[PDB]
With several copies, the nearest count.
Chain A
């Protein structure tokens, strides 16, 4: 009775033709093409765990005497926000589990986007026509960071409160619109009554709406311009080689989705995050050692530490030393957002790119990427060099100076090494194409010469040295096991073999199948040669 369900659905929405095309879209299979899905699944967990978390949370600053579940804090005056966050974790069955799931999901979300951005950057997937996706994604990461920031500052504990104090005092110190801006955001002096209400609404509605909208636009725009792929065998700029949506892509997407969901569900139980009961209510007069924000916010806090005391005292005015920090952070973002355009400016490449490129074939961009990664990592480490100093027994002043000097010398060394290594990887590729795979079977000729057997991947002439093949943009095998010359020729379990008849029959079919598979790729290339001729 399923054909009658199809009949009703078709007779109304003329949907047979438009969904045949949806279920036939082919997507390239590569492990690095699943990194964006991690961000998507983490985002889904955040929305679901977040909604559950708002049924027990009161975002108020009004002071109350605590008389809840956590007896070691009974009788202390705290806000309604901290008291209800303490009630989620001590009075709701499985409330701590969900709270921890939420925070872990936030962390994974931001790191998933970072790693996905790195994949996009290195492989060159931001090139025409995919710059809109780059800009959308960059906005996504900044908003993700902002979202996480206003999320961990909701409980109104001592640790998060210092983050708000830092943020407010950063804004207030702005050259012209600095004290007027602070009064517009917080609704007055810090802290203020409306502050945790403006933060709550920006966190549960304002940002997630924008985020969901941008994500939806992101996915639709990706789905419209099929996907990029690595320049493999039979693959051109006018085709996609992979797997169709069903039955293979859809099931794989669900499996990996469950994997991420299950992993977050494990972390939510087995590890502690943001133990707010240890920290007390926010008090402007008391503080703790280190007191760092979340990992994604450490780069901003690290920027403030390594900036020297460079205040400008004009006539009856003051530019705080923090202002230059904002300038630097303003540059890093602008450099990141408008990357495809500066790429194109300095390279003079304005073509339609559908084929990816391996990082080793673009050494300047790869090296710039690793240079920028070292910059970001140094900012992150120096934002949290108090915990590094204490645990690893190094001078805190030495850490500050390492941050200051390392931001000049670290990127330079990173570029040099990365560039040289990229060219090295290029050279190793050419050796195989020119001479063949190094077998590793050293044998002695009658005269006494030790020679290593080389396996050519192309046709040879008639004097040993085989005609070297040109680079084709793809990975070339370098081991003899990569050609299946170490493949196990026993079928069976762990304790017992299979019958002979079922064994030899099975090797024959697998042999015929792999031969025909290679033949498809060969035939593809041939048609593509004639296609590109025209």
Chain B
């Protein structure tokens, strides 16, 4: 490939060449929505925003509960026994809300914004090549003889 004909390729055409050097063909790549400012974009954006804000709240909750909450052991019939027995559960609730919500936000983004894709790749397996087999047993045989 002369450089002269590489500058004559689009941003897309170069990629399509790129994907084909790995025996990969992109069938059915489709933009999520080719509509000018449809309300569905705002709806998808407002769903992943929900799970992002909720995750932030969960993170701040975990940090706040980790620092400022009675965590020392209280025995049966002590005053602060309720506030103590709830420390570990609160940690679980908050941490499991932070990371889980971020996960939900990330998956909802993949399903709603990143385009549909079908890629088909050629597969290279079996008894290798006729030449490579002959020249590996000949090299190994040579080094032993």
What is the interface of chain A, defined by CB distance below 8 A to chain B? 3, 6-7, 10-12, 14-17, 19-21, 23-26, 69-72, 90, 93-94, 96-97, 100, 129, 225-226, 234-235, 237-244, 246-248, 251-252, 254-259, 261-263, 265-271, 352, 354, 491-493, 496, 498, 502, 505-506, 509, 513, 516-517, 520-521, 524
B121 proximity list for chain A (CB < 8 A): 24-26, 226, 239-240
What distance in Å separates the Cβ of A2 from its nearest Cβ neighbour in chain B? 10
Cα distance, A269 to B113, chains bound together (Å): 34
Residue of B nearest to A235 (CB): B120
Cα distance, A97 to B96, chains bound together (Å): 12
Given contacts A267-B92, A270-B93, contact A248 B117 (CB under 8 A): yes
Cβ-defined contact, B95 with A520, below 8 A: no
Interface residues of B in 45-75 (CB under 8 A from A): 66, 71-73, 75
What distance in Å separates the Cβ of A510 from its nearest Cβ neighbour in chain B? 10
Residue in B39, B103, B128 whose beta carbon sits within 8 Å of that of A14 in the complex: B128
Cβ-defined contact, A24 with B93, below 8 A: no
Cβ-defined contact, A20 with B120, below 8 A: no
Cα distance, A468 to B110, chains bound together (Å): 39
Given contacts A15-B128, A90-B73, A225-B125, contact A269 B89 (CB under 8 A): yes
Given contacts A20-B132, A262-B96, A265-B96, contact A240 B123 (CB under 8 A): yes
Cβ-defined contact, A262 with B99, below 8 A: yes
Given contacts A241-B119, A243-B119, contact A491 B40 (CB under 8 A): yes
Hey, what's the 0/1 contact readout for B16-45 against A, CB within 8 Å counting as 1?
001101101001101001110011100100
Given contacts A70-B73, A251-B110, contact A16 B129 (CB under 8 A): yes
Cβ-defined contact, B88 with A97, below 8 A: yes
B139 proximity list for chain A (CB < 8 A): 20, 23-24
B98 proximity list for chain A (CB < 8 A): 262
Cβ-defined contact, B73 with A513, below 8 A: no
What distance in Å separates the Cβ of A483 from its nearest Cβ neighbour in chain B? 19
Cβ-defined contact, B75 with A71, below 8 A: yes
What distance in Å separates the Cβ of A522 from its nearest Cβ neighbour in chain B? 11
Hey, what's the 0/1 contact readout for B94-129 against A, CB within 8 Å counting as 1?
011111111110110110001011111111111111
Cβ-defined contact, A269 with B95, below 8 A: yes
Given contacts A21-B22, A491-B40, A493-B43, contact A352 B126 (CB under 8 A): yes
What distance in Å separates the Cβ of B65 from its nearest Cβ neighbour in chain A? 10
Residue of B nearest to A21 (CB): B22
Cβ-defined contact, B125 with A14, below 8 A: yes
Residue in A24, A71, A354 whose beta carbon sits within 8 Å of that of B73 in the complex: A71
What distance in Å separates the Cβ of B40 from its nearest Cβ neighbour in chain A? 7
Given contacts A244-B24, A502-B38, contact A263 B122 (CB under 8 A): no
Q: Which 6 A-B pairs have the closest CB atoms?
A: A269-B92, A266-B96, A262-B99, A262-B100, A16-B128, A258-B103
B88 proximity list for chain A (CB < 8 A): 94, 96-97, 100, 269
30 inter-chain pairs at a CB distance below 8 angstroms, sorted by A residue, are A6-B137, A11-B127, A14-B128, A15-B128, A16-B135, A16-B136, A17-B136, A20-B135, A20-B136, A24-B18, A24-B24, A26-B120, A90-B73, A94-B71, A129-B125, A234-B120, A238-B123, A243-B118, A247-B144, A248-B114, A259-B103, A262-B98, A266-B100, A267-B96, A268-B91, A498-B39, A505-B35, A513-B30, A517-B116, A524-B27
Which size bracket describes the interface of B in this complex? 35 or more
What distance in Å separates the Cβ of A100 from its nearest Cβ neighbour in chain B? 7
Residue in A17, A93, A225, A492 whose beta carbon sits within 8 Å of that of B129 in the complex: A17
A238 proximity list for chain B (CB < 8 A): 122-123
Residue of A nearest to B117 (CB): A243
Cα distance, A243 to B95, chains bound together (Å): 31
A261 proximity list for chain B (CB < 8 A): 99, 103
Given contacts A14-B128, A244-B24, A491-B40, contact A258 B102 (CB under 8 A): yes
Residue in A129, A225, A252 whose beta carbon sits within 8 Å of that of B107 in the complex: A252
Residue of B nearest to A3 (CB): B137
What distance in Å separates the Cβ of B9 from its nearest Cβ neighbour in chain A? 16
Does chain A have a CB within 8 A of B4? no
Residue of B nearest to A128 (CB): B126
What distance in Å separates the Cβ of B105 from its nearest Cβ neighbour in chain A? 8
A259 proximity list for chain B (CB < 8 A): 99-100, 103-104, 107
What distance in Å separates the Cβ of B46 from its nearest Cβ neighbour in chain A? 10
Cβ-defined contact, B118 with A520, below 8 A: yes
B38 proximity list for chain A (CB < 8 A): 502, 506
Does chain A have a CB within 8 A of B2? no
Residue of B nearest to A496 (CB): B39
What distance in Å separates the Cβ of B121 from its nearest Cβ neighbour in chain A? 4
A19 proximity list for chain B (CB < 8 A): 136
Residue of A nearest to B26 (CB): A244
Cβ-defined contact, A266 with B92, below 8 A: yes
Residue in B21, B95, B129 whose beta carbon sits within 8 Å of that of A265 in the complex: B95
What distance in Å separates the Cβ of B64 from its nearest Cβ neighbour in chain A? 13
A513 proximity list for chain B (CB < 8 A): 30, 116
A242 proximity list for chain B (CB < 8 A): 118-119
Cα distance, A240 to B140, chains bound together (Å): 22
B116 proximity list for chain A (CB < 8 A): 513, 517
Does chain A have a CB within 8 A of B143? yes
A239 proximity list for chain B (CB < 8 A): 120-123
Given contacts A97-B88, A258-B99, A262-B98, contact A352 B22 (CB under 8 A): no
Cα distance, A352 to B102, chains bound together (Å): 42
B73 proximity list for chain A (CB < 8 A): 69-71, 90
Residue of B nearest to A234 (CB): B120
What distance in Å separates the Cβ of A513 from its nearest Cβ neighbour in chain B? 6
Residue from A10, A15, A100, A496 with most neighbouring chain B CB atoms (10 Å): A10
Residue in B92, B102, B118, B123 whose beta carbon sits within 8 Å of that of A268 in the complex: B92
Cβ-defined contact, A20 with B21, below 8 A: yes
What distance in Å separates the Cβ of A508 from its nearest Cβ neighbour in chain B? 11
Cβ-defined contact, B92 with A265, below 8 A: yes
Cβ-defined contact, A244 with B119, below 8 A: yes
A90 proximity list for chain B (CB < 8 A): 73
What distance in Å separates the Cβ of B77 from its nearest Cβ neighbour in chain A? 11
Residue in B33, B90, B103 whose beta carbon sits within 8 Å of that of A269 in the complex: B90
B33 proximity list for chain A (CB < 8 A): 506
